[PDB]
Scaffold this active site. Structure first.
Site, PDB file in Angstrom:
ATOM      1  N   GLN A 119    -106.956  48.030 -82.768  1.00  0.00           N
ATOM      2  CA  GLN A 119    -106.122  47.575 -83.872  1.00  0.00           C
ATOM      3  C   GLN A 119    -105.728  46.110 -83.751  1.00  0.00           C
ATOM      4  OE1 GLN A 119    -102.735  50.281 -82.359  1.00  0.00           O
ATOM      5  NE2 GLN A 119    -101.631  48.700 -83.506  1.00  0.00           N
ATOM      6  N   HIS A 159     -95.542  54.446 -81.837  1.00  0.00           N
ATOM      7  CA  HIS A 159     -96.971  54.162 -81.784  1.00  0.00           C
ATOM      8  C   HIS A 159     -97.742  55.408 -82.187  1.00  0.00           C
ATOM      9  CE1 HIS A 159    -100.403  51.703 -80.669  1.00  0.00           C
ATOM     10  NE2 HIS A 159    -100.894  52.704 -79.962  1.00  0.00           N
ATOM     11  N   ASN A 194    -106.117  56.350 -78.239  1.00  0.00           N
ATOM     12  CA  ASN A 194    -105.362  55.176 -78.647  1.00  0.00           C
ATOM     13  C   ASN A 194    -106.296  54.207 -79.360  1.00  0.00           C
ATOM     14  OD1 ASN A 194    -103.225  53.398 -78.950  1.00  0.00           O
ATOM     15  ND2 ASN A 194    -102.714  53.311 -76.767  1.00  0.00           N
TER      16      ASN A 194
END
Length: 209
Positions: free
Chosen positions: A18, A155, A175
């Site tokens: 990201q 998150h 993740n």
């Protein structure tokens, strides 16, 4: 099942990054939808985080958002492919391109319910939120995590399976920080802290095909 790993089932795309943009909620939503389509249709199609980042109107762009409302957006509007609408690491103009995938809806798992969380993980990938603001979480490299969590759920990630090593139950956590974080981008978080380790069971949700 005593263990589940969707990465070994040909329905999970490689770890993504990201960057700085707080678009974790888009990566979490996309990852859950991508695997669901792979499970239900035996078809691997990479979807657009960028569309959610630019077009989903309940969220805050690169300052956080909601994978739940991203699911509702996909059910209502559809979602285009990553090829057609690639991630540019920042929010841009909302483009409505040719859509490739829909879903029918989404469900929320009640807070703190790891038993129901495991039952859903045995069938698909689930979107979860964790407490990531800590030195231990950011610099995690390997093993079943036993370090300190962040102060608050901040998150968005995914659970792509579960298992055990040396009698220690864990979740397999996907993740969006690239492959240099954790175990090639993943973390093994203890399975079975009230709310789950780092709050993993506080806000679990998953798309309905």
């Amino acid at each position: 099942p005593n263990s589940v790993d969707w990465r070994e089932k040909d329905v999970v795309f490689p770890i993504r990054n990201q960057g700085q943009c707080g678009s974790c909620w888009t990566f979490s939503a996309v990852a859950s939808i991508e695997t669901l389509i792979g499970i239900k249709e035996d078809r691997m199609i990479a979807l657009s985080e960028q569309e959610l980042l630019d077009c989903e109107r309940t969220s805050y762009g690169c300052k956080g958002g909601y994978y739940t409302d991203a699911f509702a957006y996909v059910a209502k509007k559809g979602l285009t492919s990553r090829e057609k609408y690639p991630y540019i690491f920042q929010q841009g103009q909302c483009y409505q391109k040719e859509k490739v995938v829909k879903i029918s809806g989404y469900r929320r798992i009640p807070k703190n319910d790891e038993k129901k969380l495991q039952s859903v993980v045995a069938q698909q990938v689930v979107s979860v939120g964790v407490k990531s603001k800590s030195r231990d979480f950011q610099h995690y490299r390997s093993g079943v995590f036993s370090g300190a969590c962040g102060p608050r759920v901040d998150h968005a990630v995914n659970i792509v399976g579960y298992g055990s090593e040396g009698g220690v139950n864990y979740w397999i956590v996907r993740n969006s920080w690239g492959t240099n974080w954790g175990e090639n981008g993943y973390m093994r978080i203890p399975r079975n802290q009230s709310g789950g380790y780092c709050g993993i069971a506080v806000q679990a949700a998953y798309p309905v095909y």
